[PDB]
Design a protein around this ligand. Structure first.
Ligand SMILES: [Cl-]
Ligand code: NA
Ligand code: NA
Length: 206
């Protein structure tokens, strides 16, 4: 599947209004294809921390862009391998659309949920999907995430359902961009939102 990403990134069939965005992705993205030991089928919380650390290969003093980081991490989780990572030096906020990122990484726009009104409701929706279909990995899009200095802004992050021995499955939120706290608790991540709340969930399906 990594070779498909390479084919799409380099293709000539791109509207030149998108070519700058695609060049930004190309410059940021690294693809490690060497055959290595996979992560386990049943992921641990520790596995998620290692995966989140891997995707964010930005230079010191650069933050990268959450839309690209979250897509990379989602892709890696899906394949149970550290394949994609970002060294993006471009803006954390502007110049990357989730639609273009999804087309590049996954080969299509991912289907988004209906809008959810709180991170609590996100958690419940994800647990519902896990209960019914055992869907366990998602990209979360938030409309009014409070980022340092800039304030309310769109933000993408991840969530994975972790199933530990003899414990109820729980949602682990993962924010590979927020390197101060890459595995926030619900309570912690809620601090970054006021009531101005809108969230969407999406996931890659093969
Ligand atoms: Cl910014
Ligand atoms: Na950095
Ligand atoms: Na935090």
């Amino acid at each position: 599947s990594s070779q498909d990403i390479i084919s799409r990134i380099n293709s000539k069939n791109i509207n030149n209004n998108d070519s700058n965005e695609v060049k930004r992705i190309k410059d940021a993205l690294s693809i490690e294809s060497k055959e290595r030991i996979l992560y386990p089928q049943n992921l641990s919380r520790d596995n998620l921390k290692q995966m989140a650390r891997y995707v964010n290969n930005t230079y010191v003093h650069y933050s990268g862009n959450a839309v690209l980081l979250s897509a990379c991490l989602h892709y890696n989780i899906h394949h149970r391998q550290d394949i994609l990572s970002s060294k993006n030096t471009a803006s954390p906020t502007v110049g990357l659309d989730s639609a273009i990122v999804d087309k590049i990484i996954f080969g299509h726009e991912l289907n988004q949920s209906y809008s959810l009104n709180s991170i609590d409701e996100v958690e419940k929706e994800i647990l519902n999907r896990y209960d019914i279909k055992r869907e366990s990995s998602f990209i979360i899009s938030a409309e009014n995430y409070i980022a340092p200095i800039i304030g309310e802004s769109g933000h993408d992050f991840n969530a994975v359902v972790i199933s530990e021995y003899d414990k109820k499955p729980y949602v682990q939120f993962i924010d590979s961009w927020k390197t101060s706290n890459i595995l926030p608790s619900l309570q912690e991540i809620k601090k970054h939102f006021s009531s101005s709340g809108e969230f969407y969930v999406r996931a890659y399906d093969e």
